[PDB]
Amino acid sequence: RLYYGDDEKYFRKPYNFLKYHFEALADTGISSEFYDNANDLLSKVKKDK
Amino acid sequence: ISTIQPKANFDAQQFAGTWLLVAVGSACRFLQEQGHRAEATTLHVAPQGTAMAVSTFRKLDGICWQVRQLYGDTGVLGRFLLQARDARGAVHVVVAETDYQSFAVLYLERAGQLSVKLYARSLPVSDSVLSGFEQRVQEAHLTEDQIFYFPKYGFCEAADQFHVLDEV
């Protein structure tokens, strides 16, 4: 038999806790921004007499 | 219920490797209560000194699971102790018979609760062997009505890293 052990099915809540809501949530957020700029100039003058 | 003799000169290095569960008999209710859909089970037996690491590979809802367990050496050749991790109790496992390339008949008891299993190296199994197992079940005093043959195909090997109990 392959089975799930019942142990720890409940926990005693301490008096000071009003609530202890087990609630499985996940949220993921990703951002990715790529800015690449390349500029080239050439300027040539010859003046011959 | 007795410590029957193990396999005469049991050899973990010959018994090592793949074994296919053929059938089990026991009173254990879950064999019958939700006893349906029992998945094919296969063992890899790995010598670990006198003990063996044994990995049972099994499906669970099609999730392939490997259970890592030590058949801890009792010091009697072919008798092993499975330690309890605060499990319900240790299991005494006597390898009562085998042909290392063919078949093994393993006797397992916990807390005086006994079970017997037929393992084979091959999908086809000589009906001779199976009948012998039946005989040893009668000698086990278990009814035939407690024999639960396991489905012939759908073995799984090499369970995911996440689908390993690592029980050791």
Side-chain angles (χ1 to χ4, degrees):
Chain A
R1 93 180 293 223
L2 193 62
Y3 81 97
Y4 306 93
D6 44 355
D7 312 314
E8 305 176 280
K9 191 173 280 173
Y10 307 86
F11 296 131
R12 191 175 184 190
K13 188 177 59 56
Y15 161 87
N16 293 305
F17 300 97
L18 187 58
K19 86 191 187 188
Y20 202 103
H21 183 45
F22 284 71
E23 190 173 20
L25 311 181
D27 296 15
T28 302
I30 314 195
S31 61
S32 310
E33 328 182 12
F34 190 9
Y35 327 121
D36 192 344
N37 307 269
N39 307 303
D40 181 8
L41 303 200
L42 300 95
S43 305
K44 190 190 302 153
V45 183
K46 319 181 182 183
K47 193 179 301 178
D48 320 327
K49 312 177 301 177
Chain B
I1 177 59
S2 65
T3 58
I4 69 172
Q5 295 298 336
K7 169 65 181 182
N9 59 19
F10 173 83
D11 186 352
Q13 307 48 21
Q14 296 177 72
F15 192 58
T18 308
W19 284 99
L20 289 53
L21 182 57
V22 189
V24 184
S26 188
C28 182
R29 190 190 60 220
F30 320 104
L31 287 285
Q32 68 175 355
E33 173 156 90
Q34 184 264 325
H36 66 76
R37 172 61 37 194
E39 295 325 302
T41 87
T42 191
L43 313 179
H44 298 179
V45 175
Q48 189 182 337
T50 48
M52 309 80 73
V54 185
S55 299
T56 315
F57 319 72
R58 200 188 182 284
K59 293 172 174 283
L60 189 68
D61 312 329
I63 313 309
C64 184
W65 290 80
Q66 190 195 177
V67 191
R68 286 155 165 50
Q69 298 184 304
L70 304 195
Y71 285 7
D73 55 303
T74 62
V76 176
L77 186 61
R79 298 195 180 139
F80 307 99
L81 186 74
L82 283 62
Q83 181 173 0
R85 72 163 38 159
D86 168 17
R88 302 181 266 203
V91 198
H92 304 281
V93 177
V94 184
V95 178
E97 193 181 25
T98 171
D99 169 31
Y100 304 108
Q101 66 268 21
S102 184
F103 83 96
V105 186
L106 292 54
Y107 282 64
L108 315 87
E109 168 267 305
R110 173 183 65 233
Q113 322 310 307
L114 189 142
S115 203
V116 306
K117 316 184 186 171
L118 178 62
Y119 299 91
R121 294 304 193 152
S122 64
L123 168 140
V125 182
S126 191
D127 44 322
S128 61
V129 174
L130 163 61
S131 310
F133 184 66
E134 301 175 14
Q135 298 298 336
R136 249 178 268 288
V137 158
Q138 298 287 356
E139 187 263 306
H141 198 64
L142 294 163
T143 79
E144 102 288 343
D145 176 296
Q146 302 158 288
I147 299 327
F148 313 103
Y149 320 86
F150 286 66
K152 301 300 187 177
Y153 52 77
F155 308 101
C156 189
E157 323 92 18
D160 214 5
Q161 164 179 6
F162 297 109
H163 302 142
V164 70
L165 295 193
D166 162 282
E167 161 170 295
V168 181

